[PDB]
């Protein structure tokens, strides 16, 4: 596992992990074993703690810290508390008669491990939320600490993303295969696969209506839509069985219409309209995101639909993915940092219709040099990426959370000369869901 000794290496702390996942019901407990020597503890006891520390920049740091967790393990049993776990008990396999363990628990609504990025000349201040398991030995809790008697680990809490999206992806690939198919066999196989995917998706529930009742009217409408979709798949499959491939392809093209019906109901969209004087008709703009939950590094494709009847041409399209970070503290300020920018010289004739799909990807390596970003750890570490979006409170408090991180996509249209019309699409970025010893030191 992982270990780390004090500057006076007479006190060694082990842990089963360095990163702990947040289950909304209950975070995993912290299991560890404390190895000491009673001779150096002639009249003294070893201590363990856990705090949700706050950092900035006696290191010239302002602090607003709130959590306490106490389990002392010398002797290990004042009372036989022992809510034991398998690895914690088995860790005595190689450890002698001084190794007494500990067990901790984290509240299920604490903020995750987020850290803002400062710099020599930064657009934002330095702040962060991080956890620490600190161990030490002295006569009592209130006694002054010392550096030759301390081990201070730093652990991390991570939220992982929560079937319908996979089913829709399968349907999209099967539809493309259907369009590109040339014989009846591939058509039939694709139709079978999409029928299975559509049924499986109909068995599921959408994220937006989760709080509503299972028998609520919205769920009825959703299942009705998937019923229509499966019926159209059935018609295409029957035509494919008859062998007439072209009619099957048209019946599959009808699935485009039913998918368009589903999208405007259950996917992020936005539409703003603007008009000017000395004209007759206004300008209309629309955009849509394919999905809501995104994975770090997964490209984001942004549909753009534009129509116009004005007397002005437009040759510019700008698509961006913008950071948004909150600081729920006394220094309250708000931030916005484009993580990925896009530019094309596409066409807006005075009277014409345009629709193309553009793909973007927020990535830290290309976007590193700017300051004030939102990260989840030290930049030097390999497991450090951008900050996953702060899952909003389920009606809980906001001030105590500290740092809220969110993402949304902007599409801008550059009005020609003789504001610039824009839409926004909120979305979500998240990470996808004997003993050998090692050192904890990062």
């Amino acid at each position, epitope marked *: 596992v992982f270990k780390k000794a004090s500057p006076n290496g007479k006190l060694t702390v082990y842990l089963g992990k360095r990163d702990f996942v947040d289950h909304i019901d209950l975070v995993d407990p912290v299991d560890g074993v404390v190895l000491v020597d009673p001779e150096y503890l002639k009249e003294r006891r070893v201590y363990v703690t856990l705090t949700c520390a706050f950092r900035y920049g006696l290191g010239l740091t302002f602090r607003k810290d709130l959590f306490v967790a106490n389990v002392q393990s010398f002797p290990p049993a004042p009372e036989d508390k022992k809510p034991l776990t398998r690895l914690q008990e088995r860790l005595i396999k190689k450890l002698g008669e001084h190794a007494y363990p500990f067990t901790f628990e984290i509240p299920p609504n604490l903020p995750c491990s987020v850290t803002l990025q400062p710099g020599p000349e930064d657009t934002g201040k330095a702040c962060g939320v991080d956890y620490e398991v600190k161990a030490f030995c002295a006569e009592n809790l209130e006694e002054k600490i010392h550096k030759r008697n301390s081990v201070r680990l730093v652990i991390r809490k991570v939220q992982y993303a929560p079937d319908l999206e996979d089913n829709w992806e399968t349907l999209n690939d099967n539809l493309k295969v259907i369009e590109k198919a040339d014989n009846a066999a591939q058509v039939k196989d694709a139709l*079978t*696969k999409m*029928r*299975a*995917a559509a*049924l*499986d998706a109909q*068995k599921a529930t959408p994220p937006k209506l989760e709080d509503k009742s299972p028998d609520s009217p919205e769920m009825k409408d959703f299942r009705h839509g998937f*019923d229509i979709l*499966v*019926g159209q798949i*059935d018609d295409a*499959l*029957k035509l494919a*069985n*008859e062998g007439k491939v072209k009619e099957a392809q048209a019946a599959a093209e009808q699935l485009k219409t039913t998918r368009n019906a589903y999208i405007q109901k259950y996917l992020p969209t936005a539409e703003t309209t603007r008009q000017f004087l000395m004209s007759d008709k206004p300008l209309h703009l629309e955009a849509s995101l394919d999905k809501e939950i995104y994975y770090h590094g997964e490209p984001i494709s942004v549909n753009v639909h534009v129509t116009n009847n004005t007397n002005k041409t437009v040759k510019k399209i700008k698509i961006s993915v913008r950071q948004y970070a909150d600081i729920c503290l006394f220094n309250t300020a708000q931030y916005k940092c484009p993580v990925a920018m896009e530019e094309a010289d596409d066409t807006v004739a005075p009277s014409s219709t345009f629709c193309k799909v553009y793909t973007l990807t927020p990535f830290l390596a290309n976007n590193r040099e700017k300051r004030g970003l939102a990260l989840d750890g030290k930049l030097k570490h390999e497991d450090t990426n951008l900050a996953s979006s702060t899952l909003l409170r389920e009606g809980a408090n906001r001030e105590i959370l500290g740092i809220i991180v969110s993402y949304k996509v902007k599409v801008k249209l550059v009005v020609s000369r003789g504001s610039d019309v824009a839409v926004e699409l909120p979305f979500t970025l998240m990470h996808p869901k004997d003993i050998v010893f090692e050192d904890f030191a990062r």
Partner: antibody, heavy 124, light 108 residues
Framework: EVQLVESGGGLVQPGGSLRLSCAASGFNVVDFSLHWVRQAPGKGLEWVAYISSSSGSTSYADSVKGRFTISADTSKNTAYLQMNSLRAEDTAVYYC?????????????????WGQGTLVTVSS | DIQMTQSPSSLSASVGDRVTITCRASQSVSSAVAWYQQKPGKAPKLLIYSASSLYSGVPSRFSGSRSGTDFTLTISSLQPEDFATYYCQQYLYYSLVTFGQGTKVEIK
């Protein structure tokens, strides 16, 4: 009540023809689909063919693709199966089964009401 | 064609014991699996449809569970009617129906 009466079996020389009739009572054929499920003696069940009277669509099996012919009759609540050039492998007892339509529970309940079955035998 | 296979080709159990019968799909069929209990020389009977749901009339000591593409059935066997061959059918589409090789529950 629901009863799937299946009759029309017998012994036929190789290359001969037979007409297996599946009569239904207690429900009209215009509301459900009708299949055929084989059973070889001492083996598992096997799918044969089916018909749906709401669309006239029929599909057969890879073993009896070019030989059998299925046709329904709404006014009599019977769906006819036609045997042509029966081989030796078709010496199996045949069942008639009913399957609902897509929208709703009936599709999910696959083959809720079967038939007693008739036995056909092919020998030289 | 979607293929159905039953692994425990024969089971031996006595009255009152617990019996489990498995099935494994070769392709993703969202539920769409039904189990039939074929008595010696009798037509199949519908026990469990939708891969988990019960059919009215069938006794209550029958249940199923789906995990990925693997389907299982569980009984608390009684004397008269729980000793026969059981089957596993996939019914995704009208012209895609394939049955599984049966399994027999003898008496020790």
């Amino acid at each position: 009540e629901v009863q799937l009466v299946e009759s029309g079996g017998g012994l036929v020389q190789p290359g001969g023809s037979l007409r297996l009739s599946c009569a239904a009572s207690g429900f009209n054929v215009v509301d459900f689909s009708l299949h055929w499920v084989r059973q070889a003696p001492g083996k598992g069940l096997e799918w044969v063919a089916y018909i749906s009277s709401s669309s006239g669509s029929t599909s057969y099996a890879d073993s009896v693709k070019g030989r059998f012919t299925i046709s329904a009759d709404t006014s009599k609540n019977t769906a006819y199966l036609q045997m042509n050039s029966l081989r030796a492998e078709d010496t199996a007892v045949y069942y008639c089964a009913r399957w609902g339509y897509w929208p709703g529970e009936p599709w999910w309940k696959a083959f809720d009401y079967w038939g007693q079955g008739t036995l056909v035998t092919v020998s030289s | 064609d979607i293929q159905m296979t039953q692994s425990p080709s024969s089971l031996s159990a006595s009255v009152g014991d617990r019996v489990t019968i498995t099935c494994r799909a070769s392709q993703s069929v969202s539920s769409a699996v039904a189990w039939y209990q074929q008595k010696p020389g009798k037509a199949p009977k519908l026990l469990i449809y939708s891969a988990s749901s019960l059919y009215s009339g069938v006794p209550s000591r029958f249940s199923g569970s789906r995990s990925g593409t693997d389907f299982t059935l569980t009984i608390s066997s009684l004397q008269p009617e729980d000793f026969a061959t059981y089957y596993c059918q996939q019914y995704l589409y009208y012209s895609l129906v394939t049955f599984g090789q049966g399994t027999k529950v003898e008496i020790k």
